[PDB]
Amino acid sequence: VNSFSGYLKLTDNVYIKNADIVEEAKKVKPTVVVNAANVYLKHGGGVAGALNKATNNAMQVESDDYIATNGPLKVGGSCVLSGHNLAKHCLHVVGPNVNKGEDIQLLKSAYENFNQHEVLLAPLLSAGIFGADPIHSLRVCVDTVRTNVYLAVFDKNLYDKLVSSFL
Ligand SMILES: CNC(=O)Nc1ccc(C(=O)N[C@@H]2c3cccc(O)c3C[C@@H]2C(=O)O)cc1
Structure with a gap:
């Protein structure tokens, strides 16, 4: 039993809810919140901009130190940083950005990062300003993630x- 409330069950392990991930994180305080990151961890807009704003820019400060030490992430890759006031940890995951011409097959690799965590609160990778079809993203999520994802x-x-279109 966990504290996530009001989700529709899509599969054995995937749940979905119409919710603002910032507000949901503040209420649940999950072990892991997923950020829709880019390789530079520049959290300017979309989900990332919203999560970073909710941390009063502390996420960005931590991220800049991470990049200064380690260099950029890979598209399809991830890193674990602090969740600040939102979660214990933030898993920054880089889905492909269609508006940069990145290969949509990298979406499955991006979702594979979720399998390293037993339970996660997450957005649909590559959706929104990343330009992919969210229906496709949901299908890849269900067919790739085996851990419990909200x-x-x-x-x-x-x-x-x-x-309504989910198979
Ligand atoms: C104060 N709180 C706040 O600003 N929150 C906040 C802001 C922005 C986003 C975001 O960009 N969402 C994206 C989006 C939009 C439309 C269609 C979409 O396919 C998506 C994918 C993303 C998602 O829904 O996961 C999410 C939360």
Whole structure:
């Protein structure tokens, strides 16, 4: 039993809810919140910008030190940093950005990072300003992630479409 509330069960291990991932993280305080990161950990907009804003820019300060030490992530890769006031840990995962021409096959590799964590609160990777089809992203998620994932979908219209078209 865990504290995630009001989710629709899609599969044995994947759950979804129309929710603001920032508000959901503040209420649940999960072990892991996933950020929709880029390779530079520049959290300017979309989910990343929102999570970083909710940390009063502490996420960005920590991220800049991480990059200064380690260099950029790989598309499809991840790193674990602090969750600040939102979660114990933040798993920064880089899905491909279609608006940069990145290979959509890297989406499966990106979701594989979730399997290193037993339970996660996460957005749909490569959705939103990353330019991929969220229906496709949900399908890859369900077919790749084996650990327990609670997906927060900000847009109600998209949530309903994600739900009604789900196979
Ligand atoms: C104060 N709180 C706050 O600003 N929160 C916040 C801000 C932005 C996002 C975001 O960009 N979401 C994206 C989006 C939008 C439309 C269609 C979409 O396919 C997606 C994918 C993303 C998602 O829904 O996971 C999420 C939360």
